[PDB]
């Protein structure tokens, strides 16, 4: 079974510096190409670099050359990016692949801001008062003013899964996220049941329960 | 070399035949592949050399050539095949994708059921407030909110986004967030939130009076 997984990614300021791995397994890079290829935001696939681990012979994208380095290390069966002098456009996910490109790695999330770390406030968006009695609710939590993304919500530590809808992401004008997650529920249940949303912020190590009451 | 590809999305019921096309700014031979992905996903190689089906990939997928044109064809929709498509030149370097192809699934119309909700004290507490709309489950995803204070219109001051399809019932939700300072909030009392979609019959409006428990 062959496999690549990609390690290293992370916020970094412009101009910064930050290397990504990409190790295999289930075949020897010694045999084939490596490339890096990302996707940022609306701009679709572009691919970044490749290199042949056998003689280290590479190429490269116009928009990363002189400032990236592509390697490998064939007694690790890994291959590395180097990134220098890196800029917002660069933020992207970071995927490696082999050669057509027939298996790809998970990729790794590079964030390239000068700004701080933040976690979010999590403020209760409360069932109706003028919910229909036996009909449906609707309740949920809204994630504000973090960065970088992501966030991760669920709902009663897991237990609660039908119905619910997280939400894209929405970049305010302060240049902090916000987010909402919901879920819809029986009316009658609103007196009888607790409702936790559990909001997970692993960039600045925030976890957050909060109860969302009638 | 470019790679254009058209459509940008479709929506397909399972059991269509589905065609995606990719056309190159230069002859690039047969050198041209076809991927699939999916959110939060590796992409998967389907297509080599414009007409070849990569091991373990169902037969109902294909490649053709013709010319400086490569036309993806799946001959038979299967619900595991709804992602987004993109072909790839590598006659030369660098190679280069197409802007891709986003393959939905067709279904009923389905009204939005519509919910409003006002700041919480622990917000305006904080000092600011964020007004939400919720449109939950609806179909087609085309849209329209329209945030209304005192029966004022408003413009400019909402941020919307919206799911992908519901695995369960394939539709779309909406979230928005009509955003206002403390003071600005305060001074006014009718917070409404009016929505246009296909399902409903006449628009739709959620309201609450500031204050009211």
């Known amino acids: 079974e062959v496999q690549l997984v990609e390690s290293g990614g992370g916020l970094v300021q412009p101009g910064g510096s930050l290397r990504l791995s990409c190790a295999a397994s289930?075949?020897?890079?010694?045999?084939?190409?490596i490339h890096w290829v990302r996707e940022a935001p609306g701009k679709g696939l572009e691919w970044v670099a490749r290199?042949?681990?056998?003689?280290?012979?590479?190429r490269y994208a116009d928009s990363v050359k002189g400032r990236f380095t592509i390697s490998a290390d064939t007694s690790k069966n890994t291959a590395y990016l180097q990134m220098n002098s890196l800029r917002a456009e660069d933020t992207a996910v970071y995927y490696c692949?082999?050669?057509?490109?027939?298996?790809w790695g998970q990729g790794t999330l590079v964030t390239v801001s000068s700004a701080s770390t933040k976690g979010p406030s999590v403020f209760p968006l409360a069932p109706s008062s003028k919910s229909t009695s036996g009909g449906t609710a609707a309740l949920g939590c809204l994630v504000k003013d973090y960065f970088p993304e992501p966030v991760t919500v669920s709902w009663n530590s897991g237990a609660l899964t039908s119905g619910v809808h997280t939400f894209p992401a929405v970049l305010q004008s302060s240049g902090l996220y916000s987010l909402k997650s919901v879920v819809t529920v029986p009316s009658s249940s609103l007196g009888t049941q607790t409702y936790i949303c559990n909001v997970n912020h692993k960039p600045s190590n925030t976890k957050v329960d909060k109860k969302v009451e009638p | 070399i470019q790679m254009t590809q058209s459509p940008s999305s479709l929506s397909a019921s399972v059991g269509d035949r589905v065609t995606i096309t990719c056309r190159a700014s230069q002859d690039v031979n047969t050198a041209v592949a076809w991927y699939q992905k999916k959110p939060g996903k590796a992409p998967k190689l389907l297509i080599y050399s414009a007409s070849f089906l990569e091991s373990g990939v169902p037969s109902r997928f294909s490649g053709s050539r013709s010319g400086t044109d490569f036309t993806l064809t799946i001959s038979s929709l299967q619900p595991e095949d709804f992602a987004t498509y993109y072909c790839?030149?590598?006659?030369?370097?660098?190679?280069?994708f197409g802007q891709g192809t986003k393959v939905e699934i067709k279904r009923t119309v389905a009204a939005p059921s519509v919910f409003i909700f006002p700041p919480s004290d622990e917000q305006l507490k904080s000092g600011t407030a964020s007004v939400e709309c919720l449109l939950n489950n609806f179909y087609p995803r085309e849209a329209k909110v329209q945030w209304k204070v005192d029966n004022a219109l408003q413009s400019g001051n909402s941020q919307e986004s919206v799911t992908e399809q519901d695995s369960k019932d394939s539709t779309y939700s909406l979230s928005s967030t009509l955003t206002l300072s403390k003071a600005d909030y305060e001074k006014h009392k009718v917070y409404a939130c009016e929505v246009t979609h296909q399902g409903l019959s006449s628009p739709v409006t959620k309201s609450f009076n500031r204050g009211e428990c």
């Open positions: 289930g075949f020897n890079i010694k045999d084939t190409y």
């Open positions: 692949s082999r050669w057509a490109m027939d298996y």
């Open positions: 790839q030149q590598h006659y030369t370097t660098p190679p280069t």
């Open positions: 290199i042949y681990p056998t003689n280290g012979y590479t």
